[PDB]
Amino acid sequence: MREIVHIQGGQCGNQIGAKFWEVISDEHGIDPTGTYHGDSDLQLERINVYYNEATGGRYVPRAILMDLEPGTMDSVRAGPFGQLFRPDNFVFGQTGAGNNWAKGHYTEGAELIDSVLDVVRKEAEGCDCLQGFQITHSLGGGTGSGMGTLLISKVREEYPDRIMETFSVVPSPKVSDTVVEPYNATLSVHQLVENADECMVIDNEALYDICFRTLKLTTPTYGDLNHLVSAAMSGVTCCLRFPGQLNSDLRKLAVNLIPFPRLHFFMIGFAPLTSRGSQQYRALTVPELTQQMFDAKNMMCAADPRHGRYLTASALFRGRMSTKEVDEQMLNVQNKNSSYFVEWIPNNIKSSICDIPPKGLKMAVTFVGNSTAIQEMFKRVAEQFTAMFRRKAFLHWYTGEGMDEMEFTEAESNMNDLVSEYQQYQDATA
Amino acid sequence: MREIVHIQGGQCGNQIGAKFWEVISDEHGIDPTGTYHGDSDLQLERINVYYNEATGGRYVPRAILMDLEPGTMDSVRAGPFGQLFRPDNFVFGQTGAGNNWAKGHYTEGAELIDSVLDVVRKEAEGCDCLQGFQITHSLGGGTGSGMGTLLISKVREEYPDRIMETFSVVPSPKVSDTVVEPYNATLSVHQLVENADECMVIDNEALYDICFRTLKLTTPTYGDLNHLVSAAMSGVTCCLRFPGQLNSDLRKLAVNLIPFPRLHFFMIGFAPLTSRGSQQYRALTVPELTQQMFDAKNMMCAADPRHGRYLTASALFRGRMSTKEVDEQMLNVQNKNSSYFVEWIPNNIKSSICDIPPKGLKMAVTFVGNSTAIQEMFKRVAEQFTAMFRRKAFLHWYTGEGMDEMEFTEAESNMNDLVSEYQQYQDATA
Amino acid sequence: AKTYQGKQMFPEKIKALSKDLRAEHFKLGNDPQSYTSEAAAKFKEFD
Amino acid sequence: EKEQKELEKDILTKAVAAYEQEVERKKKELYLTNKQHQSSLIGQMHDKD
Amino acid sequence: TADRNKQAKVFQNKELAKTNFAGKSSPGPAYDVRDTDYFTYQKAPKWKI
Amino acid sequence: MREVISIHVGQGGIQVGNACWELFCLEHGIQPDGQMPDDAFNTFFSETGAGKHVPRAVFLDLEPTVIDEVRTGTYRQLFHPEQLISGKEDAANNFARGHYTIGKEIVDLCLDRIRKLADNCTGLQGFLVFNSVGGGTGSGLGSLLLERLSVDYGKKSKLGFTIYPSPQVSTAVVEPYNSILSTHSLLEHTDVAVMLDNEAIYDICRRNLDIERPTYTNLNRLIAQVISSLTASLRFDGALNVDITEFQTNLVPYPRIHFMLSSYAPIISAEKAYHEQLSVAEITNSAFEPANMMAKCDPRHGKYMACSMMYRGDVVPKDVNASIATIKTKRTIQFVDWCPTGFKVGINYQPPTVVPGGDLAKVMRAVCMISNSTAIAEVFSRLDHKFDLMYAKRAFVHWYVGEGMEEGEFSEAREDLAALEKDYEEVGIET
Amino acid sequence: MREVISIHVGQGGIQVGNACWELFCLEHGIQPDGQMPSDGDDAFNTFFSETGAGKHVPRAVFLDLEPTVIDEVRTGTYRQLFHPEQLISGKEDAANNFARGHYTIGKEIVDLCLDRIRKLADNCTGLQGFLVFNSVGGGTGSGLGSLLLERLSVDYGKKSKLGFTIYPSPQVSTAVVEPYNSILSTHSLLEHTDVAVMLDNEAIYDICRRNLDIERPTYTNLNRLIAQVISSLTASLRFDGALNVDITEFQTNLVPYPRIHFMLSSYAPIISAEKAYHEQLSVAEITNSAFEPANMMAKCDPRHGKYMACSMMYRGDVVPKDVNASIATIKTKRTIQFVDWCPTGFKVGINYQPPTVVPGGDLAKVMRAVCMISNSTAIAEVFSRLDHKFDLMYAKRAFVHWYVGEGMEEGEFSEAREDLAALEKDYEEVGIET
Ligand SMILES: Nc1nc2c(ncn2[C@@H]2O[C@H](COP(=O)(O)OP(=O)(O)OP(=O)(O)O)[C@@H](O)[C@H]2O)c(=O)[nH]1
Ligand SMILES: Nc1nc2c(ncn2[C@@H]2O[C@H](COP(=O)(O)OP(=O)(O)OP(=O)(O)O)[C@@H](O)[C@H]2O)c(=O)[nH]1
Ligand SMILES: Nc1nc2c(ncn2[C@@H]2O[C@H](COP(=O)(O)OP(=O)(O)O)[C@@H](O)[C@H]2O)c(=O)[nH]1
Numbered sequence A, B: 001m002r003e004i005v006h007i008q009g010g011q012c013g014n015q016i017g018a019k020f021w022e023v024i025s026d027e028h029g030i031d032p033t034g035t036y037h038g039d040s041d042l043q044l045e046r047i048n049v050y051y052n053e054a055t056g057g058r059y060v061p062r063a064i065l066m067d068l069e070p071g072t073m074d075s076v077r078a079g080p081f082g083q084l085f086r087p088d089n090f091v092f093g094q095t096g097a098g099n100n101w102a103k104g105h106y107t108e109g110a111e112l113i114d115s116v117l118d119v120v121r122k123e124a125e126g127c128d129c130l131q132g133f134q135i136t137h138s139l140g141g142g143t144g145s146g147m148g149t150l151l152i153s154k155v156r157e158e159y160p161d162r163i164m165e166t167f168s169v170v171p172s173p174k175v176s177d178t179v180v181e182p183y184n185a186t187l188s189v190h191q192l193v194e195n196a197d198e199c200m201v202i203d204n205e206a207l208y209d210i211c212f213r214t215l216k217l218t219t220p221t222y223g224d225l226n227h228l229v230s231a232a233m234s235g236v237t238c239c240l241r242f243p244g245q246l247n248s249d250l251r252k253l254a255v256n257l258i259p260f261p262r263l264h265f266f267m268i269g270f271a272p273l274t275s276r277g278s279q280q281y282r283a284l285t286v287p288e289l290t291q292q293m294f295d296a297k298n299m300m301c302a303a304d305p306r307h308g309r310y311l312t313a314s315a316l317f318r319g320r321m322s323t324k325e326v327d328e329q330m331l332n333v334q335n336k337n338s339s340y341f342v343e344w345i346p347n348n349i350k351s352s353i354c355d356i357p358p359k360g361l362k363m364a365v366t367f368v369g370n371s372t373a374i375q376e377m378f379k380r381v382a383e384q385f386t387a388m389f390r391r392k393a394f395l396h397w398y399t400g401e402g403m404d405e406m407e408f409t410e411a412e413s414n415m416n417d418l419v420s421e422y423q424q425y426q427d428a429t430a
Numbered sequence C: 001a002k003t004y005q006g007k008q009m010f011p012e013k014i015k016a017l018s019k020d021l022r023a024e025h026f027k028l029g030n031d032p033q034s035y036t037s038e039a040a041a042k043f044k045e046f047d
Numbered sequence D: 001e002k003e004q005k006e007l008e009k010d011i012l013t014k015a016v017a018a019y020e021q022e023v024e025r026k027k028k029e030l031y032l033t034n035k036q037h038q039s040s041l042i043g044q045m046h047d048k049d
Numbered sequence E: 001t002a003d004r005n006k007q008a009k010v011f012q013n014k015e016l017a018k019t020n021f022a023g024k025s026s027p028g029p030a031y032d033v034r035d036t037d038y039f040t041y042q043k044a045p046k047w048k049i
Numbered sequence F: 001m002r003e004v005i006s007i008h009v010g011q012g013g014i015q016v017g018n019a020c021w022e023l024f025c026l027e028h029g030i031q032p033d034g035q036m037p038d039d040a041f042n043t044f045f046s047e048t049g050a051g052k053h054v055p056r057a058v059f060l061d062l063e064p065t066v067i068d069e070v071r072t073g074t075y076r077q078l079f080h081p082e083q084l085i086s087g088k089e090d091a092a093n094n095f096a097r098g099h100y101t102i103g104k105e106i107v108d109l110c111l112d113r114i115r116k117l118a119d120n121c122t123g124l125q126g127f128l129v130f131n132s133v134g135g136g137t138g139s140g141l142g143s144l145l146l147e148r149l150s151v152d153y154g155k156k157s158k159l160g161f162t163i164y165p166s167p168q169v170s171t172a173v174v175e176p177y178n179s180i181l182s183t184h185s186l187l188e189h190t191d192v193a194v195m196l197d198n199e200a201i202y203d204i205c206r207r208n209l210d211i212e213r214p215t216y217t218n219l220n221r222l223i224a225q226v227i228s229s230l231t232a233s234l235r236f237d238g239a240l241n242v243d244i245t246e247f248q249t250n251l252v253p254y255p256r257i258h259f260m261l262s263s264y265a266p267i268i269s270a271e272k273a274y275h276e277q278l279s280v281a282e283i284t285n286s287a288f289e290p291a292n293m294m295a296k297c298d299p300r301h302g303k304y305m306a307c308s309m310m311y312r313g314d315v316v317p318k319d320v321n322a323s324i325a326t327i328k329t330k331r332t333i334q335f336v337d338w339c340p341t342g343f344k345v346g347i348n349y350q351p352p353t354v355v356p357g358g359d360l361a362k363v364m365r366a367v368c369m370i371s372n373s374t375a376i377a378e379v380f381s382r383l384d385h386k387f388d389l390m391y392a393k394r395a396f397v398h399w400y401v402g403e404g405m406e407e408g409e410f411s412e413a414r415e416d417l418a419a420l421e422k423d424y425e426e427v428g429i430e431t
Numbered sequence G: 001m002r003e004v005i006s007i008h009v010g011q012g013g014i015q016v017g018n019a020c021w022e023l024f025c026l027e028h029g030i031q032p033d034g035q036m037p038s039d040g041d042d043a044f045n046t047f048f049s050e051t052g053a054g055k056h057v058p059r060a061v062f063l064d065l066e067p068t069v070i071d072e073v074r075t076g077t078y079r080q081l082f083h084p085e086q087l088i089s090g091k092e093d094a095a096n097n098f099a100r101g102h103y104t105i106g107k108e109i110v111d112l113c114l115d116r117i118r119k120l121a122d123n124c125t126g127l128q129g130f131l132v133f134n135s136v137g138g139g140t141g142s143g144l145g146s147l148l149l150e151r152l153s154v155d156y157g158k159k160s161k162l163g164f165t166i167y168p169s170p171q172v173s174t175a176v177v178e179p180y181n182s183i184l185s186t187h188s189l190l191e192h193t194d195v196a197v198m199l200d201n202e203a204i205y206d207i208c209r210r211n212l213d214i215e216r217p218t219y220t221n222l223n224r225l226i227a228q229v230i231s232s233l234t235a236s237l238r239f240d241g242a243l244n245v246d247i248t249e250f251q252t253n254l255v256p257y258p259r260i261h262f263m264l265s266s267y268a269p270i271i272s273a274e275k276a277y278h279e280q281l282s283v284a285e286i287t288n289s290a291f292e293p294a295n296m297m298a299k300c301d302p303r304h305g306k307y308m309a310c311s312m313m314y315r316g317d318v319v320p321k322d323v324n325a326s327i328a329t330i331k332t333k334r335t336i337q338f339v340d341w342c343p344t345g346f347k348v349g350i351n352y353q354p355p356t357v358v359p360g361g362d363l364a365k366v367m368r369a370v371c372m373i374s375n376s377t378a379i380a381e382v383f384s385r386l387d388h389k390f391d392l393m394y395a396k397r398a399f400v401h402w403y404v405g406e407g408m409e410e411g412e413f414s415e416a417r418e419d420l421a422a423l424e425k426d427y428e429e430v431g432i433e434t
């Protein structure tokens, strides 16, 4: 029941998806051949949320992989747990968007999306009671942002009442590798805000920073960044698959974190994280978790919440713990730092307890917070975008296939509208 | 009882028939020497439908192999299972028609067809109570469409109350092997509508697409294409040879499919069809079967069923299953796609169940659907026909063998009148 | 002719590099856990 | 039904594994067919020379 | 919502070589290569009286 | 039980006729003596009852050197002794001699030999006739024989393999004369004519075969290969068989238009044969290349009426269909408006054979095409212009008139070419 | 399923093509006769084409109007590799005359060459673009190259073309008329090539002498460097990498405007075995040698102008996190300055295949290397000095009678000068600040 399908798009998205299914399968005890070898009966009770049952009793994930380049599949297929995916679900072209939003949205995505949208119907129609969709993609690449945002429109257009999530990676100027990142990122966020129910921003800059500061490992790699995101992804829907004191599905979090319909851009963080040098020195307690929960450096974004005011906060506790400690700690944090919390919404922190902790850690926490500090990331992207656009630089490739300048200007104003509107509540008082 | 006789003509028909008998023989466990070596008692209960008993305890198919050249007949005799056919039933000329409809219907048609009716009359009278006839042939060739269509006319005038079936292969525009295809295809349709009780159209283009995309096999061949069609022919009469929950012989299909006497052109398909490397990820269930069964890609014709509306449809199921599960699927598919089903005829899907699955599978379905979208093929064939006929190209051969151009005018109008009368019900409303 | 001659030159490193860059290198806390629910531990059958 | 469901597991894995050899065998013999057929030209090259 | 055509565009295997070599064919037989053996051989001498 | 009889008249036909018979004998394993060391040889040969086989062919000529060359060669024991018709006085490049003076006393024996062969056959498919058109007995006897066979047998199919003069390379000076007079005979008496001028075959040998000094021995081997590919479906089983009667019913839109030109592929020497793969997709591209046309004509100057290509080897039905659709995509190749589909395709299993001492490299795939195009109107125009120059001052006329031919026979022959050309121009214009 | 076709025209193009094809054969492990040794596939499909059994055929065609260099290839150790009919040779050389190779002789070879190009392109399914090599200072190089580009443009359309031209050096020169045929060739290629690379000979001499410690460099040494550059540029198509970059991801990241597609190259490390192992050659330091001005492969100083964009490729065992720190350090450095309307100006690619070492060569074996391709406003100086040279020559109409009598009109030289002046104005107005 309330099962959800998985869609990953682009080269960056597939890497997230490949590691995510490795994390979930280990949690549910599914071998790379898809045969269940678990120990407890709870591991199979709610396995229909993410998996489908085929002939012979094996389990196959309900994930749809898309791209515009055939190089992507042979790396993910040849990797560990690459045999779980149904070969019929691979849909992608042969040319590639070339880090161009227009190509991935106008001239090639349109011709191909009819095929991928079919298997989306096949997966969604087979569900007895669909809960929602989740999309993984990056906002710095062409096909990831291009086809990725266009699916958001058509999926929403056919399933309006369902819930929608996007784990989007935005480009940061500190670590940037493509000169047209400001262009395609600006256009995507225009279409994303109209359709996505919940959006989550993840930064490579913060992921590199958290690895250097907390984990203190000498050389991070794309495996580490993928795993940190995948750990937080499973925590969001953990209580949906396992019992707990206060179960809280996807819809419940959406209601309690969105005061107004256009404010649905969250930043997430995970705890506890510690280097194995100090792993045996730390003491795992509920007060210990919440201190690292609200740490500014622990956030998966470079937007500092201390530069703004929290609107709403959500905490999902995992493990065997008491309710009184959970309730009292949120109250104490909300009182010790009352300056950082907007005042006309009293007690604006939500809590949930699931008593099946992640493997390895006795207790763990995922944090989802809506704060006014995220506006500065849209601003700094806009500053770069408006700098290049005034001189018409790198433009004839976007305008060479039907796109025109009014689309860029229209995206500029609406994005500027969103940020100006988003800081309205930062200074608003009762 | 209620047995049928098989008549095959032309190079295409003989290859279709040769593989069809091999499929039936394995189904009933009949060795190529005519000795029964089956395992189930049911395999011998209804063997008189297709086989005639002979002295020594061997069975001989009641097939009339007819042609104008000995080249294709010598090949089918040298192949496996070629010793089943009685040598008397091989009737063939020496000169051949050669893609000339006039030659195969007027010059060499009249002088040789006296012999074939002689053996047909012998076979038809011998049986206890005849059920009907079935003919496999190609409309793109001379002898197959020329003498084949005269054979039907002579038989129909002698057996007016019997069932007549033809499995017709029409020439598609994408794949063409003869330059004179439009002429001999148009003339046969004029004669085919007046006499045939049921007509089924097959495409070489559609069969190639199915093998390349669905079966995912690198080396298709005419042996493989004939395999798909052979399974379809065995499916329609499966419940006539074996018991089941709902028995529905060939005549019962006619009543529930043809609303008006001139609308008897069906398009068929078979399921499940899957690649041999991806059959371990699928699940064989009734809901999964009906999705592939109603898919436009699975259909054995180039016409798109979603471009028109279904008048009536019929599905035959083989294997063990629950009737409630089948009935709800027909109801559910009708409600979800009410736009594609004509409204002034409620409950326009017929379901039948037989409890003998095909060898090597646990479930199978056969789909026969009278859809208004089949008018596309008559449109494209006429468009090619009217292009050639305006310049009188390739016409001196037909007028050179006792035919006149007036017959072309009658054929063109009657075929055109078929399309107009057939499109009328597409937009008909209550 | 003197410069270009027939030269003797002679994927494991590629695979080793590829697997490492998707690897963990840092694992997580070590697992002492056994699955048990909160509603099943408190409510037990009594004599 | 639990056993027959498991009884379909070993049948399927053997049938799929068996299918692999025909894919490999056809490729192996095709190379041999071309290898000997190419070597016929070297005979033709010498005869022409 | 996908017809029979415009679906083969999706990549399937290395078997698309049998159907995709000549989309960018640089059309066909547009150039001439007739009697271009003047370069590989030596032309016959032509003599004035 | 299917038979074809081949007629070889003149020196040009006989020497091409010889090269056909090393290939036919080699395919079926028949030794030059004629004794084998199932019934596939029945198309060309005939069992003698015990042992040897004799060809179903007759050689006609008036000049003994070429015939006596055959009767003393390595094939002296193959042909029937009294089916090699040899004369005494050569026609000597004169059409009037071979049609009015010599041919009146020659055909009677010739039709007797044809009758004896025909009565032996039971399923006679048709006749094949070989003759160079720019010669005396080549056209003089060929015109007479075709006219006589048109009334003796009637509806039988006659295929003509002629060798028209090259645009600028020739060995005779009066050949523009006897070529035109022959056209008026074979236009109304031959079901299928093939364009096989010599200059185009020189270019193929120089470019593809890497031969710098081609000879008449080399050319006839190429022509022999085309004959084998054309009739390969009659004696070898295949996936798609095409009979002899399935050429006129598919390549002749109107009775007047029956002139087609052929191409063959691949033709590559062993030095660079398998330095490339020779896929089925590329061999069909080489067939349509204008340089590979066996006749000196440019298909790019006109539309295509109909196309018939025969595949032999290990091809499969998937790949021809993919290749044909590619050709229709091409813009440089344009078909006539009233013919949407114009390809007739046949597939055979027997690969082409290799003759010892030859030049062609052995391959597992081959294709031979007979194409009907409006571009063939050029060859008639250029020969018509040559005839106009000489006939302006009545040169060489006194030779023809003295041999019983009327003065005005040239005038009625010239008008036929003008009538023929206007037919091609009329057909090509779109509606 | 991705392919690319390489065109070699002129003696210099053929000479560099020989070296690059030797390098590719060594890298993919194919013997010079074409046969695979002894007995992981499709790594060669980018450059080669399987014959169906054993040997391979390169996707290249060799052009020249003089057989002196071509016949060497047909006789040398690589006589069994190339297809015999794709090494196309003429009979009379252009003799340093652009008019001869563009109006008199070049029009007899171009049809056959395009037929060969069709016969090569119809056998490929994923052609990313064309690679064309030519030396600009020669007659047939400039003439046939320009005609080839002009015909390929109309015959193909949007297919990318990459030209690795070799402009004459500022003061070091071989011929005396080579300023003349450079102007016309530049005018022809400006509106017909998509990406052009500047590879003048004088700079490569300095790089060799300073790094490889060669006191007498020869044309053989220079060609190896260009071959290594091509291998680094194209390895991302045919080898597995962490952050792949295709050919089409150049014309979306390197050329801000359609008329500005002239760009420089730099390679590092270039070092001999005698001092290769005295340092660790970390990625932090090799990226500094890439931006070192004297290491640029073209005789142009980036310090005299702004930087537009920089697309630079790594190969070896480089880690993505290490690249970012070096890029941040470079951006922090003040001596290198970018245009204001380009906040982010780096495109980085990472590949796993280390640079293969040629036996008997000069370079040592190193675990890491970087190839840098930059676009900058500093390239304006190379045209200005060539413009001055051409003006000095054309002031009193010298050597012109050798061009007028071969079909070129008198006024052709005037139009090319206007094109060069407009191009310089375009760079100046692009480089000006807002
Ligand atoms: N293809 C081919 N053509 C030939 C051959 N020998 C002669 N010809 C052609 O025949 C033409 C002239 O005819 P001839 O071969 O001299 O003999 P003919 O046609 O029988 O006429 P007569 O001289 O009267 O015997 C020449 O223009 C040649 O083109 C040959 O061996 N092969
Ligand atoms: N990098 C490099 N450049 C060369 C080489 N050989 C010649 N060049 C350049 O080529 C220019 C002159 O052209 P050539 O290579 O001699 O020959 P071409 O370009 O075909 O012109 P033609 O001599 O008329 O045939 C000179 O200015 C050189 O800069 C070489 O081996 N390596
Ligand atoms: N977390 C993570 N990010 C990646 C990975 N590979 C690439 N990226 C990011 O994705 C961005 C480039 O996106 P791209 O691959 O072009 O997206 P695409 O156009 O959809 O293929 C870069 O800025 C990288 O930071 C990975 O394996 N893991």
Ligand SMILES: Nc1nc2c(ncn2[C@@H]2O[C@H](COP(=O)(O)OP(=O)(O)O)[C@@H](O)[C@H]2O)c(=O)[nH]1
Pocket: B009, B010, B011, B012, B015, B016, B098, B099, B138, B140, B141, B142, B143, B144, B145, B169, B176, B177, B178, B204, B222, B223, B225, B226
């Ligand atoms: N399904 C199928 N079709 C075939 C086969 N062989 C030929 N055809 C089709 O039949 C057409 C030719 O018809 P033909 O054999 O001449 O018909 P006939 O004249 O009656 O013998 C071709 O276009 C093929 O597409 C076969 O084995 N199976």
Ligand SMILES: [Mg+2]
Pocket: F010, F011, F063, F090
């Ligand atoms: Mg003679």
Ligand SMILES: [Mg+2]
Pocket: G010, G011, G093, G138
């Ligand atoms: Mg030179």
